């Protein structure tokens, strides 16, 4: 998962293109840095390699993920809840949340995740969306 | 002191320095500096001299 | 939250076209403005306007 030049989306501030690892040592203790340039606004992330996977940044999903979404998405308190079910970092549990700003949140970062998984051509994309929205 | 302020009732390690940062006070504080100060006078020109 | 490196770009309009266009002369500003979570070491950097 944690490579050079790899593709693993975070699971709030979306996808990174990892460019390099660093051993930025913190008192001595080589720590295995990982960047992250993830471009929303490119802020820059420096993680530990180890403490990724205790904070869950994942690899993309596959065509079976977004067959996954699709399938939730073919059957259309609560609203606390629900933006709480984004932090999962399920990617079942994301297409849940789609079936006023927290679907806004939900829609995009699925699109993100629709065209990472195939690279099927981004935002514009979000009308392939549009049409698995009647399902 | 806003910053300081608002890391609080943000999240934890959900936020960015983007959010945090707030240059209202700076831009307001530079503008209310150069006028309205005794100091910041109208350009007197005569001549060169 | 760690800031460093303030940054200066060139101007927006010229001299005599500010002067008579009425607003003032002026440059945009930049910094590195860098927030780390240190409960386990988690740097985010920018280039905050």
Known sequence: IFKVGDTVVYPHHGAALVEAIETRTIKGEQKEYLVLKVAQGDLTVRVPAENAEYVGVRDVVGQEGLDKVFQVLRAPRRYKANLEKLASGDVNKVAEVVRKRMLAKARQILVGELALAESTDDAKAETILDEVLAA | ?49 | ?49
């Open chain 3, 1 to 49: 939250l760690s800031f460093s490196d303030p940054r200066f770009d060139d101007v927006k309009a010229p001299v005599d076209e500010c002067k008579d266009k009425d607003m003032t002369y002026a440059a945009p500003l930049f910094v590195t403005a860098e927030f780390i979570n240190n409960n386990t070491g988690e740097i985010k950097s920018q280039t905050v306007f």
């Open chain 2, 1 to 49: 002191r806003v910053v300081r302020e608002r890391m609080t009732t943000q999240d934890v390690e959900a936020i960015t320095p983007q959010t945090l940062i707030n240059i209202r006070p700076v831009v307001a504080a530079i503008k209310e500096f150069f006028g309205t100060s005794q100091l910041s006078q109208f350009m007197d020109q005569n001549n060169p001299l």
